């Protein structure tokens with residue numbers, strides 16, 4: 299009933315729902331070519347398997363829970379002067395959750411959602427995002443009702459203005475190909491709105507999750523207290539099918555001399571690792587470097603087992619073997635980079651939006667000749683990269699990158715370009731690294747900006763397996779069951795796309811493939 303508790307639940311579900319996070323490991327992480335090799339990632343997204351049920355998870359999870367609850371809470375709270383803050387916060391978080399739906403699937407229920415709700419055109423949903431965030435920002439008033447269930451900003455309603463105006467930046471940059479004039483105007487208005495935007499890391503929008511032991515039992519699916527994305531990236535089958543990194547991502551980090559290379563990824567021997575927890579793994583990364591062993595990250599479409607890499611004999615593992623000889627010294631699949639333990643904790647925050655992103659958005663707007671302030675595009679980009687690197691230090695307990703290590707990176711392969719194209723590539727490639735823990739935003743921004751320039755699994759010699767088509771999908775399909783619950787509205791949506799629900803159909807804001 300209570301709208302403040304409704305907000306809590308909505309925030310927890312965003313990364314707490316173990317059912318929903320399957321979609322990100324199956325599809326998003328493969329489409330963005332950040333992870334590859336894990337059976338689920340490779341089979342589904344890596345090889346373009348059309349599976350309606352796997353594609354439906356965001357739609358179902360939100361319309362039956364968070365978004366339904368929030369819409370209700372907003373409606374009960376709407377026209378109350380004495381409840382104007384909780385109202386405005388709900389409106390802002392409603393917009394965010396809706397942004398995930400429309401960015402996955404195209405046209406969708408918004409205005410009439412919460413008996414046979416229309417599928418609002420994506421254009422008009424985005425129209426509503428700006429209007430909603432602008433009104434919410436203007437209604438916030440810290441003298442009125444206080445917010446009690448807020449796991450992002452603990453009720454700091456000033457920081458909600460910063461988030462709202464920051465989301466305005468994000469959505470304005472999103473529509474900057476389809477509708478440049480509106481994009482510019484909405485971006486410049488957002489900078490001038492009450493509260494401003496997120497100018498530094500202390501106003502980062504992060505959902506606070508607790509430490510609960512990972513469980514894949516039935517009771518676990520109703521428990522959103524933990525970060526279930528991190529739970530899943532550890533794995534239901536963690537020894538055989540862990541989060542192996544994709545070569546596009548690992549090679550970007552490694553070949554650019556990126557300081558985060560061995561903060562995001564390690565090579566681990568997992569023979570002695572427990573199920574349930576990433577404890578007792580054996581880090582062989584430094585050993586591999588010292589001995590000159592090639593890393594073998596997984597090309598798009600590849601499993602961990604094919605191609606089966608040349609390895610080496612680990613002296614560390616040979617040491618372990620004398621005391622308990624069920625350990626192999628001979629490494630094979632372990633030379634394949636995996637996601638570092640820092641990113642496999644239920645502690646991990648739920649990333650909504652960061653100061654690092656705002657910097658990249660500011661840099662891009664500057665490159666596009668918008669009127670955004672007096673700071674240079676290059677400086678904005680540099681601040682963005684610094685913030686994205688420090689994001690790991692502050693939130694995932696990674697090692698600090700020294701001023702010297704940063705300066706060496708930024709003056710060489712991390713450098714802002716000179717050409718507009720080069721600058722856009724740099725900003726958006728770097729933003730792609732930042733968004734690793736925000737898959738929803740990572741896939742949207744990859745599709746929108748066109749960077750990094752990803753190649754289809756077909757180009758890596760896996761065309762023979764690309765069951766659902768050759769090109770990397772650019773959306774996910776509506777759940778089949780919408781055909782019977784919401785037929786008229788469902789059929790109208792599909793008539794706009796050409797009469798088929800195709801996952802190669804470009805979303806309205808996506809102009810190029």
Ligand SMILES: OC[C@H]1O[C@@H](O[C@H]2[C@H](O)[C@@H](O)[C@H](O[C@H]3[C@H](O)[C@@H](O)[C@H](O[C@H]4[C@H](O)[C@@H](O)[C@H](O[C@H]5[C@H](O)[C@@H](O)[C@H](O)O[C@@H]5CO)O[C@@H]4CO)O[C@@H]3CO)O[C@@H]2CO)[C@H](O)[C@@H](O)[C@@H]1O
Nearest residue numbers: 316317318320337338515516517519534535536538539603
């Ligand atoms: O065969 C070649 C290759 O296989 C590898 O092993 C694979 C195997 O082939 C796959 O079939 C197997 O697939 C499992 C998925 O990994 C796993 O994610 C999924 O988990 C299910 C769970 O079992 C199910 O109960 C759960 O139901 C919940 C619903 O999702 C919720 O909506 C509902 O509210 O609550 C229920 C719970 O009551 O859903 C999850 C998914 O969300 O199960 C799949 C089928 O078993 O994966 C194997 C690897 O893990 C092998 O490793 C290779 O070596 C080999 O060459």
Ligand SMILES: [Mg+2]
Nearest residue numbers: 745746810811
């Ligand atoms: Mg595109």
